[PDB]
């Protein structure tokens, strides 16, 4: 589990999911399977980075809101 094996596995899985959902054999086009693996890995890594950034820029804003509330007295 390194945010990339899960991404690659999920991309390959959704590639076979799309391929077999049209009633086709699962491994029709291997090239789109490998590009799906790549896209899944990239999207998973970027999702992890975006989550970290979202938390980082949410804490610094929640602190500002709490400080603004604390100046009531």
């Amino acid at each position: 589990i390194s945010a990339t094996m899960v991404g690659a596995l999920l991309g390959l899985g959704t590639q076979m999911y799309s391929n077999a959902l049209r009633k086709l054999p699962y491994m029709r086009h291997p090239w789109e399977h490998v590009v799906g693996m790549g896209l899944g890995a990239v999207f998973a890594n970027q999702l992890v980075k975006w989550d970290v950034k979202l938390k980082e820029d949410l804490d610094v804003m929640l602190a500002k809101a709490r400080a603004a509330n604390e100046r009531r007295y």
Binding site: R22, K23, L24, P25
Partner: protein, 85 residues
């Protein structure tokens, strides 16, 4: 009276043309349905999903439409035809 012509071909190079469209009528074979290379689909046959048509079958519906249902097989050397009435 019978006479030869040079338009005749003693070796049809291309093959058999398994799918024979008749004007606008086209054999509607669905994906995941096995149709052997020897099978001849002509006229307006429709093969549905999960079906299978085996080699030697001469499915042709040039007179009336012929249909094969889901997961239904037409075995080898089976000639299927249709009539006007």
């Amino acid at each position: 009276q019978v006479t030869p012509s040079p338009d005749r071909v003693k070796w049809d190079y291309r093959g058999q043309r398994q799918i024979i469209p008749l004007g606008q009528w086209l054999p509607k074979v669905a994906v995941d349905a096995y149709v052997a290379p020897n099978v001849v689909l002509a006229g307006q046959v429709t093969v549905w999903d999960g079906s299978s048509v085996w080699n030697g079958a001469v499915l042709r519906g040039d007179l009336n439409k012929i249909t094969v249902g889901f997961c239904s097989n037409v075995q080898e050397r089976c000639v299927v035809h249709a009539a006007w009435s």
